[PDB]
Design a protein around this ligand. Sequence first.
Ligand SMILES: CC(C)(C)NC(=O)C[C@H](NC(=O)CCc1ccccc1)C(=O)NCCNC(=O)c1cccc(-c2ccccc2)c1
Lengths: 201, 196, 233, 219, 240, 230, 232, 204, 213
Amino acid sequence: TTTLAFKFQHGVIAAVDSRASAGSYISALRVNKVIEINPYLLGTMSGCAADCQYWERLLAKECRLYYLRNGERISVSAASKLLSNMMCQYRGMGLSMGSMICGWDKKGPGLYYVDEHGTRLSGNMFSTGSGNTYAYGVMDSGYRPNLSPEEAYDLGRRAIAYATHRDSYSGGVVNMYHMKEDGWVKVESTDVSDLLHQYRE
Amino acid sequence: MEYLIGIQGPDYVLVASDRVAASNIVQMKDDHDKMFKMSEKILLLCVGEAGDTVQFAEYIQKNVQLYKMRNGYELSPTAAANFTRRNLADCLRSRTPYHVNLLLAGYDEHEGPALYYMDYLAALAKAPFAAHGYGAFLTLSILDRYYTPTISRERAVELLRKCLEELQKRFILNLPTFSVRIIDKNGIHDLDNISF
Amino acid sequence: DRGVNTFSPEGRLFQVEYAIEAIKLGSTAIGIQTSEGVCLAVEKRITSPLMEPSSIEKIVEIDAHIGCAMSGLIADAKTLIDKARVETQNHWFTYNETMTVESVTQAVSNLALQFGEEDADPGAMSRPFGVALLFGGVDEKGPQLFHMDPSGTFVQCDARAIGSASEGAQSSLQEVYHKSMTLKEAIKSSLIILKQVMEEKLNATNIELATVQPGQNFHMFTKEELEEVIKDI
Amino acid sequence: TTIAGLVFQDGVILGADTRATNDSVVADKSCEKIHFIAPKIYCCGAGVAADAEMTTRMVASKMELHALSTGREPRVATVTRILRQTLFRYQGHVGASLIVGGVDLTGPQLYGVHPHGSYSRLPFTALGSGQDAALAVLEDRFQPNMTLEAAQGLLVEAVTAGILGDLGSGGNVDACVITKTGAKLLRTLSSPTEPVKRSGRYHFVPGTTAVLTQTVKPL
Amino acid sequence: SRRYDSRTTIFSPEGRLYQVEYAMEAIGHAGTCLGILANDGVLLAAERRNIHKLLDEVFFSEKIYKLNEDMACSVAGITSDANVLTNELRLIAQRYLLQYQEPIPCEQLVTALCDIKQAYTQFGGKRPFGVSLLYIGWDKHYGFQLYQSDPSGNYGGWKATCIGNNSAAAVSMLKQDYKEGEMTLKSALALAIKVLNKTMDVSKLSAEKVEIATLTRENGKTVIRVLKQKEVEQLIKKHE
Amino acid sequence: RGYSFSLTTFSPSGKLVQIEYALAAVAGGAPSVGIKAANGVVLATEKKQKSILYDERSVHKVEPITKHIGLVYSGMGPDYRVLVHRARKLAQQYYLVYQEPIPTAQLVQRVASVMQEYTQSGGVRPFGVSLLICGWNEGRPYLFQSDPSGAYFAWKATAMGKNYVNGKTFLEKRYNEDLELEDAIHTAILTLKESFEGQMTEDNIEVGICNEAGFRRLTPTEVKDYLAAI
Amino acid sequence: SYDRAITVFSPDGHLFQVEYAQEAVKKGSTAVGVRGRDIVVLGVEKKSVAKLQDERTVRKICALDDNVCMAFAGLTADARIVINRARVECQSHRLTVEDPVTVEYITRYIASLKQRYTQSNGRRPFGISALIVGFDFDGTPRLYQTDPSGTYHAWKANAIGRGAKSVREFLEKNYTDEAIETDDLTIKLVIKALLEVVQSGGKNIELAVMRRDQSLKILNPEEIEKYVAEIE
Amino acid sequence: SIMSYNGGAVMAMKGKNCVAIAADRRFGIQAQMVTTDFQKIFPMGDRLYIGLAGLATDVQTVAQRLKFRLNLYELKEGRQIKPYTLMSMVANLLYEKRFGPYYTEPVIAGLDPKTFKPFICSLDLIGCPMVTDDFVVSGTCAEQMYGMCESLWEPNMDPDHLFETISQAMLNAVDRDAVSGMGVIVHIIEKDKITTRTLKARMD
Amino acid sequence: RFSPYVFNGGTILAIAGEDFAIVASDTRLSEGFSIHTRDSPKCYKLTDKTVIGCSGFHGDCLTLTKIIEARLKMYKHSNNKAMTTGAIAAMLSTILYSRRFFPYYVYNIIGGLDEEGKGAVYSFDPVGSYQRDSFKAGGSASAMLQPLLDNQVGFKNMQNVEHVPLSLDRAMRLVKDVFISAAERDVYTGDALRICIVTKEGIREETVSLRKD
Ligand SMILES: CC(C)(C)NC(=O)C[C@H](NC(=O)CCc1ccccc1)C(=O)NCCNC(=O)c1cccc(-c2ccccc2)c1
């Protein structure tokens, strides 16, 4: 698994691959890795799967309780911070959860990273998961905050693409959303290897 | 890794830290801030195992702010340092061993500035200057070579850039930009981040 | 003096009888169930012009499909509302589906007769809720309006008036209601009855109004919509 | 630490060394070991010194309180019983190998209670690291119905054999004679070692010590 | 069972906690106690009721307790409850000194205790403490201080006040005879012996019918001192 | 489970009526007397002995609490046994914790606290005993009187129980600060002898003494000797 | 533990303990607030002038956070309890959300708390009505009144304490957008209000002031007295 | 060794009605000298000092809890704590953590409050109170101090010779240790005054 | 060292069509080097629309199915309707995860009909972590049956082949032929086949013989 996200002039696009591998074996290879919490929240997943599914779904339960109580559509700070508390409670209990909370709040596009330990980071460019570093390399050399949505999308497909090309634990299809001002919209769920042949010729 | 540093002159405390929050090979963030504004005149500098830093030090921040809202005044830096010392010691043997190394730099209107050290075993020790991380092993002897009790804050910054230039030359970890704040009777002054 | 769990010589708990008398002092609320959905209008009974009209909220949201009107000790119903909210959201988390209205009004109905003064492991509730709720909503079974009272009995009702002038207003409900009624007719009718019952002259400020339709979520009519509907008077 | 016991016609007599090491180094030279339990019931201490101290002191309090309660002499059966239930509850972590002794209306009784709780009445015993030599000589010269003088010299032979023959047990021997009449704490019975003097005076005139900073505070 | 409950934590038909006001009657029957806040020190003066018999006077004072390095407290009324409150205050201030490594200011201490007395006055059904307390203590924030707390848990800072028997006449005499910010320690002694002379109707005032302890500053340390009898006879004679 | 509310409530006058009544109960108790000499303290209390059937040596009112502290009471007996066992418990905790004989002012502070806890706890009546605790240490005598309300007074010499007012007035004219111990005992026994009504014997009046050697009861032989010369 | 049911219904549906607590508020020192364009002012009547009194420690206008302050009236000790709980809860909110509390959050909190002690074993209702004034992060002014019954409301300007009928009549008459156009018209509105009920125009309430994104500002009695002569 | 994590050794000594307590001043993590004014000798009365050693957090924690129980004692009592009482208190306090022990090896030095008899005692990290008559030591470099004290101590030394003896004891004893030194503090406790003295120690 | 998990083998299988959902498993209950019983079918009829498989540690299969069915009657009591396959899936995710720290070591595969009468199969893992697939194998022989089900059902790596909808019969011959392909090679598969078909008509049961050796 390799999962990245960056933000620019026109919002935040989060791209995730779609293979889930039990050790050396490929359990399923069209997994959906990006749990959609609200109409305009977005949290990815990585590491041991059940931790991301349970704790991030539960995160959606907290956000829904908030939105019913205060009626004011919980922000990204409270989201990543609250999931940060769910993780920080079970410190060192073995939870392997590396995830990211994308969204759009009153202050603007808030991109956060929430680690199994309790690490919590705003930022411009992230890339988690077993093949994160490759996505770093192919994102940076080819990142600039004046990218239009098209060049952004192609940049994501290049990032997750080569990230699953050199990696063993990553592949399948690439999901890539576009967290715009009025909420996310799924930009593509593209095959990977076909991309790599479109990029090798 | 993470490198704090603090110097305490006549009437201030010039603390500096690194701005990297890594994950095992890659700098995930180069604009992270390791100095947590306790109150108008108290900075808290926390480094170490992730999760312990933010959780613990924000706990201390909230207790201090609570004190000020309960009694209309702030903890004198001796009191804050011995307080965080209490929580870290009482949590040293508890269910949750927080592995944080601190420096709670402060300036009181009365007693003057003081720079409290704290290893992760809750050992408190006032010092005229300190450090943490492996970079301490390459800078503290430099501070010893150049420190003087009457050092002026400009000379302080010059010294501090000698230490940090030493890290950029010799220390093994990519530490590109450093936060640097000063504390005097007028409060906190977010000075210019040192880069290389 | 006697306890809270005493049965009278007639066979009803004292505290539930005196509590169901306490609901009789609240401001009259009314909602009606139709095959298009269910509406809810309640008189705010503003006490002074210095008040903020949007403050009194007697028709609050329990989830995307369950609107909870109330009447009586408005303070008490906060624990009921938060109870229902935590319930339906936990139901969504565990079972991955919206929660039926009968399930919600039953769960929140479980707290009424949970009161005593000797078991009390916590400082649990020391008297029955002085709240009469009217959970409205739609599910796979469709529109349904479940009355509830301090005694914990939750009953399905086609249309019901609760509060101070619930007696007469309810006579207006049996007078006007018919199964084939359209939802805008429901809104108009209920506002007519409230205008019958209210002491103060009616306006778009000292009331609220919400509905929940098969495709529409819960919604509170703003000032302009309320005025547009009151143009019919 | 080499403590021993003994029982003769009239009463018991407890021995004890006076040394206490710190893992290689003789910390003390005159540490007491015949502790106090009741007005005639004494309890020697071997093993973990802190735990013998704390245990025998707690049980000392319970026997004092009990002693005011029943308006009577405390019976050593009570002391051994509370000691071995307290020791047993902790599952042997409290390495306090007591040897409690006393004189009841039933007669002189020298119990020995090990760290897990196993007590055993018996006429002579010796705990501690020098239990080898002490058990040796007590085995070799004990007799039922001994004179109190023969008991004193005999026990001194025993704890002495512990002193000379062991590393972690030295200094002076302490024997306490208990009888139906009362207790007499014969502190420092014998002193085998004599090395107390010397021949080199090591004095430095005031001023040989380089002092940096100074201050004086009147009281 | 419900026949037996006195219901000590309920309002009346007019909104007055009967147990707190009855307690105020009890302290109303206690011995008068008053201290004065000045510039160079603070003094407390309490009518003793250990007057005179075969008592031994084994203690240094009757109604004055020492609370930390830097404070002192005077109780009035129920003696036992005053004991419990004093022990509790010592425990509070020493927990503050454990958890902060500095002395506890007077305001924080008084609030910590008054939350307790309020706590009994609200729930639990126990009777409230019928013990009013006057405090004196120095702190590096606000200087010398006088805090009066009563059974209801309410407290306030004062410059000089009197609680107990004839408290009305005492506070009246203070209103007539307190010079704000200009009372010296010795002026405070003289005025206090004035008020206690006029209020204590037992008739010729003695050194035995009151005690006075004063707190001041000395060499960066606070001194809490009780007046020996010779000084009391001296100050009453001076008052004549 | 038990009643949790206090049974002692401030009467509308504000005086705790249960402690007035309890003090009336102690006021009806058997007379007791204590006087502090220069070197020790005497305790002598009247045995309200019914029929000669009683084994008078079976139980005593003057029980030692440690080697240097005593107790006499006035009023309800079993309550007194409660306070004695509690006191022995406290002095033993102090001896474990600090390794020192508990100073009597301390012990009277704690036992005074325990007597206070029941004027306020749930569904318990206050005690009905007024203790006299005599103690010696630091080379100094101590004599305290604790009441049902929990407050304790330090005394030169005192009296309680039946007719305690005439007792105290009897002591005001007959206590002098330089009174040695034996003449103190004479004064106390005379004090009880004022209103004994029954011809005291060595069986029906108890005598306790606390001096530097510690506290103890005087056997009825010795008390018989002091009952000579009167 | 004490678990008797203190607050129980009576033979009209009334909670007599709640009506009695509100009685205790009706004898409390009268307080008033108003909600202006960028300012929020609170006034607390006089309370206990008592020339020996200390001013600082007998005020009714405590701080709950940087943006949330509150008056009250009634059993002052109880209000000290509620103030403390609200402070601890504000800071716990900054711990779990990173966002300073809206006035709605802390007010609805304290209303929940008062509601619980109206309805639990062995606990009497609070005798405090709290007029918590504050600024949401957007900077809008906020006035929330909370009574012992637990029901809370937004308010333009509402008066609590003794004689709140006549004073509330005052703000009903004189609260206009000309009244709160500026600061000084607002504060002369508040003091112009209490002056019907203050003990001769005063000190004899002094007040408090909070400006948008500015910490609570109090008044000394001089600037109070300027307005005093300005209205008298 | 958890004890030598910070290093540092404190000794007391008994003389003419005056007992002198010493200590080193090097607060250091394992090999990194961090501070040279770390306090180890905490006063507990007008004439009673309790020098601790070992892991730093148990130094300061035992000192602060002890000062807690000591202020409660002096307040609740009418008296300063006698040295034997203080010893039984600290022994109780270390022993309450019998299985989680504070890594502190205190030595208590002081005078009787009334009679002013000299007093010392050392303890182990679980509370075996060992009153002595000549001296005590504590800390990572105990052995060198046993040598220097056992060779230098003499019966009945007045204050000044006492300062000479304990002076040379601490100097020689710490210079042969790596994890201690960096100066030395010394307190003389007479009947009437209390002299604080720091010493010139090797700064390396 | 006491070991609380033992691999009692036995493979399950589940397929989703346009209107049905087969579930199948071998009934060899192996352990170590023996055969406890040649009959212990690893599919458990949960409702009229939901047939749950369980392989792995047989004890946790029993306990887990018992807990599931208990939760179904709890749901039916508090809601007056049987759980759909969606709800059963999510609820079995929180059951399997609420023991995240000492897992139920039981590879579930819940196949059944959602409320739209269409196939749905929710393959799980021992610590929760579910998903909806169109086909799935689990247990001992998952690695030998999974690729062939990709081939003849997912039609992956094919060229010029019409992706025809999965018909009930061809799904049957796929199930039986693949379990034979496993019985030849997997040691833990064999001794029977328990094929349960799910349709709107109810649950019809079909069994097949396999290699016994
Ligand atoms: C394909 C299906 C639907 C069956 N799930 C698994 O096999 C989940 C797969 N989980 C296991 O084998 C459980 C192994 C296990 C055995 C015993 C005790 C505890 C765990 C797993 O995730 N193995 C790699 C770790 N997690 C991931 O690599 C990962 C990362 C990001 C997302 C997901 C994910 C989450 C939900 C659905 C799909 C994918 C998984």
